[PDB]
Amino acid sequence: PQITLWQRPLVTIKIGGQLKEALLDTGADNTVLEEMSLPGAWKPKMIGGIGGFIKVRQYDQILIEICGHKVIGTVLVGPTPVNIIGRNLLTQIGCTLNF
């Protein structure tokens, strides 16, 4: 698909058997999801946004369905107000900016 930017670029994702809405975010290096239970091992990480830092749990090799594309990558879980799909996963769906 082509997605214009007059509205937030929100898409449906499936992760850990759960359906969620997430923002396609070219300004984010990483993918950051609201608190959820993901099975398996994780590592502590801190990430900085505008306004400061949040503590997150880093899960590797996590399967996510983003607009029907299955992708595997690192997802960070913590107190973000919006689920963010960052460049680490955007590249896996061949997502480009065009103008």
Ligand X SMILES: Cc1c(O)cccc1C(=O)N[C@@H](CSc1ccccc1)[C@H](O)CN1C[C@H]2CCCC[C@H]2C[C@H]1C(=O)NC(C)(C)C
**Is 29 a residue of the active site?**
no
Q: Which residues pair with 45 in a beta bridge?
A: 56
Query: 3: which residues sit within 8 A by CB, 6+ positions away?
Result: 9, 24
30 binds, among ligand X, a second copy, none (CB under 5 to 8 A by kind): ligand X
Stretch 47-66 residues interacting with ligand X (CB under 6 A): 47, 49-50
Which residues precede a break in the chain, with C-to-N distance above 2.5 Å? none
Least distance in Å: CB of 73 to ligand X? Answer: 12
Whether the Cβ atoms of residue 73 and residue 88 lie closer than 8 Å to each other:
yes
Q: Which residues bind a second copy (CB under 8 A)?
A: 1-6, 8-9, 23-29, 32, 47-54, 67, 69, 80-81, 84, 87, 90-91, 93-99
Which sequence positions are flagged as catalytic?
A: 25
